[PDB]
């Protein structure tokens, strides 16, 4: 039940991000965004609460509020790991106007379930408050995300923040001696030269989906990294088929196969987003208006969401990959 919600949320959000600019790179963390919103919901009541949880695609008849928060608590613990193969980190925090009174139930729940502390913050010194928050994100992401917060209202009351960091080695690394400039076809007729890594005689999980005109492979812990390569001019068709059903068939249909040659670009890309429009489209609306009920935070309906921002970065290189993302939910007084 939680799995159907997670995939539905991730793919719904993905399509919404694409719709704003269908030819741009997309990079995002579904779990960073959902964790931040689930954290907020700890303090929400009535329609504000139900809209948030339904917007994350949970069905409250199969899954209770307590089970949802328990799933995020468990997820948070699975995303803090270290090995010679992997470095994973995820953290949550709240930055709160120093004199604002918070309910003990909320700060207790926030620490226990989301691992969040509360940082007293002087938002009226906007430059200083932005530095405090951006430094927290920089620290958590190992310097990969440093300007999550660009503009910040001097009348902000709190900012809830999530970050995620993921660094992994390839099981079979590329030799940099075999990286060479090669064409990358943005379209059939538009192409640039990029550094193209290559490996030969590889045995990896593989599925050729003739029906969807794509090839799926897995390079590489307990997370599966799926690469989906549409045939030329078939990306839009593949995007149209993305769903839980399609992802399941991909995983079910993979089989180990010796691949003669594999070519993968070496690259780094970044995107940032304001998610208000998308969250409203997902039905999370009362949280942004004066009808907002975040009285589980303070004991009064005196807060409402103003801005939701997300930034994410992806780096792919011969030895492996590095991924990072962060989400901030900015909250004003009412």
């Amino acid at each position: 039940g939680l799995a159907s919600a997670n995939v539905d949320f991730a793919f719904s959000l993905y399509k919404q991000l694409v719709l704003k600019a269908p030819d741009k790179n997309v990079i995002f963390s579904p779990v960073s965004i959902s964790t931040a919103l689930a954290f907020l919901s700890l303090g929400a009541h009535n329609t504000t609460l139900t809209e948030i949880l339904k917007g994350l695609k949970f069905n409250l008849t199969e899954t209770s509020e307590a089970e949802i928060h328990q799933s995020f608590q468990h997820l948070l613990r699975t995303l803090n790991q270290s090995s010679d193969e992997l470095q994973l980190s995820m953290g949550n925090a709240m930055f709160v106007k120093e004199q604002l009174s918070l309910l003990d139930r909320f700060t207790e729940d926030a620490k226990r379930l989301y691992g969040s502390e509360a940082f007293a913050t002087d938002f009226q010194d906007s430059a200083a408050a932005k530095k405090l928050i951006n430094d927290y994100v920089k620290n958590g992401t190992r310097g990969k995300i440093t300007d999550l917060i660009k503009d910040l209202d001097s009348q902000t009351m709190m900012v809830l923040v999530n970050y995620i960091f993921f660094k992994a080695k390839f099981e079979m690394p590329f030799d940099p001696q075999d990286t060479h400039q090669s064409r990358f076809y943005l379209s059939k007729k538009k192409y640039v030269m990029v550094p193209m890594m290559s490996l030969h005689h590889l045995t990896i999980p593989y599925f050729r989906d003739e029906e969807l005109s794509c090839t799926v492979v897995q390079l590489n812990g307990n997370a599966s990294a799926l690469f989906i390569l549409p045939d030329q001019d078939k990306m839009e068709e593949v995007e149209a088929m993305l769903s839980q059903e399609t992802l399941s068939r991909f995983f079910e249909s993979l089989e180990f196969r010796e691949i003669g040659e594999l070519y993968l670009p070496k690259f780094s890309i970044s995107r940032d987003y304001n998610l208000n429009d998308i969250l409203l489209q997902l039905g999370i609306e009362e949280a942004f208006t004066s009808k907002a009920d975040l009285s589980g935070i303070t004991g009064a309906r005196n807060l409402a969401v103003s801005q939701v921002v997300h930034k994410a970065v992806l780096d792919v290189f011969e030895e492996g990959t590095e991924r990072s993302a962060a989400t901030a939910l900015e909250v004003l007084f009412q």
Binding site: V7, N25, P30, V31, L75, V192, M196, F227, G260, Y263
Partner: protein
Amino acid sequence: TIVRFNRPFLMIIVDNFTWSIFFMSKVTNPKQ
């Protein structure tokens, strides 16, 4: 068999147990 990522592609990082999607990307231009 040759697998050549010289055209737009997707990457998805999936939690094996819960199917939480930790990260997702579409690479349409790696020179951005």
